């Protein structure tokens, strides 16, 4: 039978890949970074508290100005907060209250949302009437939308629960490119700083790298023990960190095709929900189901501090484009800014 | 540009006013999550409530809306964690088909022991009891073939059979209920409880049952809040 031969050949290719990965594993980055000085204790405090949400929060994204932000809750509202003065600029009602993601366009002209409705809704912040209104509704996914990010005002990359990613042109409303190959639900994606590539992590404990222009899965990483919930590029763009449900974070390199760092502790037994790097990439902020946040030294794997300000699980987390502050949103319907 | 800051101030004030206006309605409405396998009667239940994601009904000036997720894929692992604040989960079980009952019990156990759903009570609707009645009366499909413990099960004394009901039917239906309550009580731990109910496709009083069960859930949540219960 041809199926058995194909399975045997795939197993042989997997063995070859493992052998090639072990060949390049001459040493570990722990030995190389054992000679650098520790960053010291990092104790951040809640400088701003953003209250007003009615239910659990799932997403946030700081814009290029590092001033405005977006947040989604299960009351069906999208609130645009001004991080500096804690003011609310907009409060966008949603037709479907079960949203899970948000995106802030680099130009600040659009916001995005999506969830169990299987629709990616784009709202125009800059309106001539002074009132925010929806612009486009992107349909075609057969699963819940997990995360979406803007490339520009004309291209949006979306991740859905039907194990597929899709690059859409907002104006035409059509799926310009379709990314397939994942077996389980894909939960998060991040775009590269040059927007040339983007990685996405799924429930099959695997991350896949995709070229936006051609839709071909360039490379694939495995190693997680459970479902992947978070992913974000290193600020350099040649590495990325992933959080999983097995209480471990893993930092991989694009060119090395291997796992570089594993961040875990024996006293944490809950999954990771959000992961993001700082401006220099030295601090990796991760959110945990144990109602806390932890900052890892992305170079020495040692915890540099804890952000215990939430009484419920933290679901979204983010750093500025300027590296100035970090926002955490949890299921208690509050956002907190740390600096 | 203090004028701009003042303008943002009244914009914020208006936004908070509208947000409180919506908050009153949100607190005044009750979420419900409808779940169950296919060919169970969930469509019939929502039709009686008058295939759709959402349903809205009002009983005694109390507004309930039920969410039934059909567009999502077969996996229920991660799109269910967004239902941790619903008032209750209406679990519909087809009692007439013994082949797929074990899947229903496994799903109920998975919902009951869920880390994010340990506070969510489950209202159990054992639908299509008439078909189970003809099934047990025919004697072609024996429960002992699928559930050996039924051979040694005795009907509980706190049973309220309908007039003229065959006690074999009563024993079978209460055996199914006993299995479900056995699954429920193992880790009930006082946070959440299961409310069994015996219903048929021709019932028109279903909406009242969920109303009473939600009243009981809120009463018991308040009692546990004050440490009485």
């Amino acid at each position: 039978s041809e199926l058995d031969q194909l399975r045997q050949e795939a197993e042989q290719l997997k063995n070859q890949i493992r052998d090639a990965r072990k060949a390049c594993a001459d040493a570990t980055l722990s030995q190389i970074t054992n000679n650098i000085d520790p960053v010291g204790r990092i104790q951040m405090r809640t400088r701003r508290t953003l209250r007003g949400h009615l239910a659990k929060i799932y997403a946030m994204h700081w814009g290029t100005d590092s001033r405005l932000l977006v947040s989604a809750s299960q009351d069906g509202k999208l609130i645009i907060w001004d991080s500096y003065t804690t003011n609310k600029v907009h409060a966008i009602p949603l037709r479907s209250s079960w949203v899970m993601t948000c995106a802030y366009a680099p130009s600040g002209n659009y916001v995005a949302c999506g969830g169990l409705d299987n629709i990616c809704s784009i709202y125009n912040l800059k309106t001539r009437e002074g009132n925010v209104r929806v612009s486009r509704e992107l349909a075609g996914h057969t699963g819940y939308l997990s995360c979406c990010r803007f490339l520009d005002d004309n291209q949006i990359v979306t991740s859905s629960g039907d194990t597929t990613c899709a690059l859409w042109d907002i104006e035409t409303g059509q799926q310009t490119t379709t990314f397939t190959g994942h077996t389980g639900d894909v939960m998060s994606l991040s775009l590269a700083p040059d927007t040339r590539l983007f990685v996405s992590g799924a429930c099959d404990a695997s991350a896949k790298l995709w070229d936006v222009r051609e839709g071909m899965c360039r490379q694939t990483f495995t190693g997680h023990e459970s479902d992947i919930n978070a992913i974000c590029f290193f600020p350099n763009g040649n590495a990325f960190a992933t959080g999983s449900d097995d209480a471990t974070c893993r930092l991989f390199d694009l060119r090395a095709d291997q796992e570089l760092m594993t961040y875990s502790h024996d006293n944490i037994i809950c999954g990771i929900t959000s992961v993001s790097f700082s401006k220099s990439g030295r601090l990796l902020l991760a959110g945990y189901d144990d109602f806390n946040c932890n900052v890892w030294d992305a170079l020495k794997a040692d915890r540099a501090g804890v952000l215990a300000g939430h009484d419920n699980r933290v679901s979204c987390l983010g750093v500025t484009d300027d590296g100035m502050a970090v926002a955490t949103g949890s299921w208690d319907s509050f956002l907190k800014i740390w600096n | 540009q203090r004028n701009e800051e003042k303008a943002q101030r009244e914009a914020n004030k208006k936004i908070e006013k509208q947000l409180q206006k919506d908050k009153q309605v949100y607190r005044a409405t009750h979420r419900l999550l409808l779940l169950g396998a296919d060919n169970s009667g969930k469509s019939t239940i929502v039709k009686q409530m008058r295939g759709i994601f959402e349903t809205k009904f009002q009983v005694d000036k109390v507004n309930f809306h039920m969410f039934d997720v059909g567009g999502q894929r077969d996996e229920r692992r991660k799109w269910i964690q967004c239902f941790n604040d619903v008032t209750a989960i209406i679990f519909v079980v087809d009692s007439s088909d013994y082949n797929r009952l074990q899947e229903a019990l496994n799903l109920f156990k998975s919902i009951w022991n869920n880390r994010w759903l340990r506070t969510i009570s489950v209202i159990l609707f054992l639908n299509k009891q008439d078909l189970l009645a003809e099934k047990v009366l025919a004697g072609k499909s024996k429960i002992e073939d699928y559930f050996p413990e039924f051979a040694r099960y005795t009907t509980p004394e706190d049973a309220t059979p309908e007039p003229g009901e065959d006690p074999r039917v009563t024993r079978a239906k209460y055996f199914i209920r006993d299995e479900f309550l056995r699954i429920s009580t193992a880790s009930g731990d006082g946070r959440h409880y299961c409310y069994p109910h015996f219903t048929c496709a021709v019932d028109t009083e279903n909406a009242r049952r969920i109303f009473n069960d939600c009243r009981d859930i809120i009463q018991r949540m308040h009692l546990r809040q004050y440490e009485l219960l």
Epitope: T163, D204, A205, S226 | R76, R115
Partner: nanobody
């Protein structure tokens, strides 16, 4: 990379005894609840067995109650299922399915279409 490989089974006369061994590699076997799932020809996947993290709690399907025995060895990282007195309706393809999350008594692995944490499947056939 998660790899759950099951072995054993095949053609056998009714009433025989068979042993199925599931090999788990690439993860902590002790921290995961494990299940045995079979797929009857022409029917969807159905739950057949269960085992907890420490083996304290053991459950079976009512149909296979009293005939199937499940054994778990955390040190060797191998899951065993021993079947005796097979029935002609017990023929199916058996998968070694792992429960989705660690340190949890919850499983959603009875899914039919796609599930990452399952093996290819070992066919067992009973006939005269």
């Amino acid at each position: 990379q998660v790899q759950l490989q099951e072995s054993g089974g095949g053609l056998v006369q009714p009433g025989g005894s068979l042993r199925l061994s599931c090999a788990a590699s690439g993860f902590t076997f002790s921290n995961y609840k494990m299940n045995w799932v079979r797929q009857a020809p022409g029917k969807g996947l159905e739950w057949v067995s269960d085992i907890s993290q420490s083996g304290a709690s053991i459950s079976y399907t009512g149909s296979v109650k009293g005939r199937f025995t499940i054994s778990r060895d955390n040190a060797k990282n191998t899951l065993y299922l021993q079947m005796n007195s097979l029935k002609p309706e017990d023929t199916a393809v058996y998968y070694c399915a792992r429960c989705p999350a660690p340190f949890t008594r919850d499983c959603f692995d009875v899914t039919s279409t796609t599930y990452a944490y399952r093996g290819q499947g070992t066919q067992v056939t009973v006939s005269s």
